[PDB]
Amino acid sequence: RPMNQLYPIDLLTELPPPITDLTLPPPPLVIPPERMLVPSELSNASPDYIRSTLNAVPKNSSLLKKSKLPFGLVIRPYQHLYDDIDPPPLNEDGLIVRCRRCRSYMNPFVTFIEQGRRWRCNFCRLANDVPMQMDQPKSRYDRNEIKCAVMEYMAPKEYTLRQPPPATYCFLIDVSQSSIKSGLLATTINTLLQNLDSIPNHDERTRISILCVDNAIHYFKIPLDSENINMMDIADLEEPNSMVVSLKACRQNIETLLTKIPQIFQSNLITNFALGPALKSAYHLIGGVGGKIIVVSGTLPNLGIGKLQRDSFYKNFTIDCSKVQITVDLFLASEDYMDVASLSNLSRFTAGQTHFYPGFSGKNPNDIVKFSTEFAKHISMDFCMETVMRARGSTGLRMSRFYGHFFNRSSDLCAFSTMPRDQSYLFEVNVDESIMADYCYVQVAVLLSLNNSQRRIRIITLAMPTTESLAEVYASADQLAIASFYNSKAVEKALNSSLDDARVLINKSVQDILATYKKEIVAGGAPLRLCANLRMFPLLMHSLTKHMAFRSGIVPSDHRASALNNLESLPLKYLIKNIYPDVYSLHDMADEAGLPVGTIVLPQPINATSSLFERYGLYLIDNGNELFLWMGGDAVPALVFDVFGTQDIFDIPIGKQEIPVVENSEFNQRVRNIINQLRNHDDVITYQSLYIVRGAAREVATLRLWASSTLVEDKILNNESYREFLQIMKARISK
Amino acid sequence: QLKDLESQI
Ligand SMILES: [Zn+2]
Numbered sequence: 001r002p003m004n005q006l007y008p009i010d011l012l013t014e015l016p017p018p019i020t021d022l023t024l025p026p027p028p029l030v031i032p033p034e035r036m037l038v039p040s041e042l043s044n045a046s047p048d049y050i051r052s053t054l055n056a057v058p059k060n061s062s063l064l065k066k067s068k069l070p071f072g073l074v075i076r077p078y079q080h081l082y083d084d085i086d087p088p089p090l091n092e093d094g095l096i097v098r099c100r101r102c103r104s105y106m107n108p109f110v111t112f113i114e115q116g117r118r119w120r121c122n123f124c125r126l127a128n129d130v131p132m133q134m135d136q137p138k139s140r141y142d143r144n145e146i147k148c149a150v151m152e153y154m155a156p157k158e159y160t161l162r163q164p165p166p167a168t169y170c171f172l173i174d175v176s177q178s179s180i181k182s183g184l185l186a187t188t189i190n191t192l193l194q195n196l197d198s199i200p201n202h203d204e205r206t207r208i209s210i211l212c213v214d215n216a217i218h219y220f221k222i223p224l225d226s227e228n229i230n231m232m233d234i235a236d237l238e239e240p241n242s243m244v245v246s247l248k249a250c251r252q253n254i255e256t257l258l259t260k261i262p263q264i265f266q267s268n269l270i271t272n273f274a275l276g277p278a279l280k281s282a283y284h285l286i287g288g289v290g291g292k293i294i295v296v297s298g299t300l301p302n303l304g305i306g307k308l309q310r311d312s313f314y315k316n317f318t319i320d321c322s323k324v325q326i327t328v329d330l331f332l333a334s335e336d337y338m339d340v341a342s343l344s345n346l347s348r349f350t351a352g353q354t355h356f357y358p359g360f361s362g363k364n365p366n367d368i369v370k371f372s373t374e375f376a377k378h379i380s381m382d383f384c385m386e387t388v389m390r391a392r393g394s395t396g397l398r399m400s401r402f403y404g405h406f407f408n409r410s411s412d413l414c415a416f417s418t419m420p421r422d423q424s425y426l427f428e429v430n431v432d433e434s435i436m437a438d439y440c441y442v443q444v445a446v447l448l449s450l451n452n453s454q455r456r457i458r459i460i461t462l463a464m465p466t467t468e469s470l471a472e473v474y475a476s477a478d479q480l481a482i483a484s485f486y487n488s489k490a491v492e493k494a495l496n497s498s499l500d501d502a503r504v505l506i507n508k509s510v511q512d513i514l515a516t517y518k519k520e521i522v523a524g525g526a527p528l529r530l531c532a533n534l535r536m537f538p539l540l541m542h543s544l545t546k547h548m549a550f551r552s553g554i555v556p557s558d559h560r561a562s563a564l565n566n567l568e569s570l571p572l573k574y575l576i577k578n579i580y581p582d583v584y585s586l587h588d589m590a591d592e593a594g595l596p597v598g599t600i601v602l603p604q605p606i607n608a609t610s611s612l613f614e615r616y617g618l619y620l621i622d623n624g625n626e627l628f629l630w631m632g633g634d635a636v637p638a639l640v641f642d643v644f645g646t647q648d649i650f651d652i653p654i655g656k657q658e659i660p661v662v663e664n665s666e667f668n669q670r671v672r673n674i675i676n677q678l679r680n681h682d683d684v685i686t687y688q689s690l691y692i693v694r695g696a697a698r699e700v701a702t703l704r705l706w707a708s709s710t711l712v713e714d715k716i717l718n719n720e721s722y723r724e725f726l727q728i729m730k731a732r733i734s735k
Numbered sequence: 736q737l738k739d740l741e742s743q744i
Binding site for chain 1: 736744
């Protein structure tokens with residue numbers, strides 16, 4: 001069969017690295033048409049939903065161990081913030097065919113046997129009976145579960161214990177003084193006010209709740225608009241209807257309330273924020289049905305249970321949330337210490353997320369833009385409730401580890417009190433017994449309660465060829481999925497062991513693979529051998545060791561915890577960009593670039609190195625977190641003019657600021673076009689602030705420093721360049 | 736505890 005072939009290369013001959021490789025699809029899943037019931041491109045799981053580190057699975061343990069390559073799965077149930085965008089086929093007749101023994105679901109790889117009266121399970125080979133329903137003008141072959149690897153069903157009654165719940169929201173807002181002064185409360189109230197119709201309400205059932213919190217927990221009874229304020233204070237930190245109300249039936253009233261809140265605490269002098277007590281109030285408030293507790297704060301918890309200092313209450317809280325189906329999202333925005341390391345656990349183990357906004361301050365008009373945009377997209381994002389996800393492997397395959405934000409203790413089941421849309425997950429697969437078939441399989445199942453009062457089951461079935469050729473295993477290795485694997489292992493090693501240990505782990509992943517490819521595979525002088533499909537692996541890991549998450553040196557605790565929290569939950573596509581940035585050379589930008597094709601055409605990305613930064617050029621750096629517009633110090637007045645209006649480069653805007661609208665400048669338009677395009681994604685909430693930097697007072701040095709550190713291919717501080725990294729590796733895998 | 740709605744066992 002056409003098993004992917006090995007394409008040997010010399011890493012030393014590919015410097016600078018051919019980074020366009022980062023946008024290439026993984027190695028093909030070689031599956032002959034006969035193994036699929038209805039052959040098509042939809043017959044095998046798409047890389048967008050699931051990516052195995054190995055698309056040519058080792059036929060046995062000893063081979064897996066020898067390859068030194070990891071076996072994991074980058075799983076991503078949803079692709080967009082809104083379920084109306086590109087949904088998979090949806091089954092509705094209620095017929096769910098499953099194997100009696102392993103419980104796997106009917107899929108494109110089962111084999112129909114005995115005149116097609118029965119079916120042999122591809123996961124455990126058990127013989128199962130074909131329900132007479134299957135053939136009730138269409139045949140069984142017209143069914144989505146037989147036609148598609150990725151599809152969905154309307155779950156029957158026995159997959160539910162209680163009627164699907166309504167989308168419930170409880171906003172826990174910090175109204176203490178730090179929040180008033182920074183403008184966080186205002187910005188938050190405003191954004192909600194501006195987005196009440198962005199919040200999903202597909203079944204018109206969505207319920208909301210508002211908790212203002214300082215030293216006491218402030219409640220609000222909201223009447224039905226149809227019967228036309230009540231603020232109930234509770235300072236007793238030791239201690240439902242009309243508190244959690246219909247977003248529709250109380251639309252005007254909820255609006256009326258949000259509008260007064262800013263006035264109510266307009267002159268609050270209290271600096272206490274009882275997160276602990278408040279978190280408990282919200283729990284009791286929505287625990288009878290479960291839902292989302294979205295915390296907005298710019299004040300370190302300092303009163304009541306759970307207070308922190310410059311805690312395990314939270315971890316136990318998450319344990320409790322898993323019982324009542326509650327998820328906690330956090331938006332931490334302040335110039336002061338927030339202990340992201342500790343609070344991020346709330347979201348992490350409840351399937352939610354924590355968003356950290358360093359130095360947030362209403363005084364900077366641009367701080368507001370970032371927070372509101374992201375907070376708005378976050379509340380407008382669709383999600384599931386009471387969801388559980390598990391992966392079933394074919395005989396010989398076992399799911400041993402699970403990474404990502406969710407709740408998992410001692411089972412193969414991952415619980416999501418709510419399943420967001422913007423995160424990714426990873427499962428480690430161990431091969432115990434030897435695989436006997438020429439193929440093995442993995443099937444992800446997600447039992448969920450959609451935010452439209454419906455119970456569904458989303459299935460993702462992936463088929464991989466087995467092989468006993470070490471060459472073939474490497475030839476089909478997914479460099480990016482593998483990069484992701486080690487990224488998660490690194491975060492764990494970091495968020496649990498040592499930061500240095502994580503660095504050590506990262507580097508070893510490269511050393512072992514390089515040493516293995518060298519000894520296990522067989523004219524020249526001194527190349528650093530590897531195959532084309534793994535050609536970006538050395539770069540990514542090396543680049544990862546320079547990321548704010550693993551950097552040697554000094555990084556503020558919150559900025560580090562945050563970076564670590566992000567790398568662990570980012571969708572593959574953005575994880576890679578967060579590790580290795582897209583850099584654009586604008587001054588010599590092709591004419592198509594900056595203009596439509598309403599999607600803007602982007603210039604081709606250049607290597608992330610200051611080597612290519614001409615002192616007279618214009619460059620745009622995108623690292624998934626921010627955007628840096630770098631203009632050379634010796635840029636021609638024409639260029640300086642075409643972009644900002646003046647000709648004095650020293651008269652250019654500096655720092656976190658937007659690019660001015662320069663009339664009659666078509667170039668100025670194309671620049672603003674590229675920046676706006678880089679800002680729209682229908683899959684993440686991220687709004688990247690723009691930083692303008694001038695090259696060749698102390699603020700200007702700081703910006704150059706920051707922008708410059710994004711170019712991960714360069715020697716940065718105490719880390720060698722990529723060029724040297726490779727040389728270091730070559731010296732190590734030598735005798 | 737080792738028993739869930741998705742397994743259907
Ligand atoms: Zn089976």
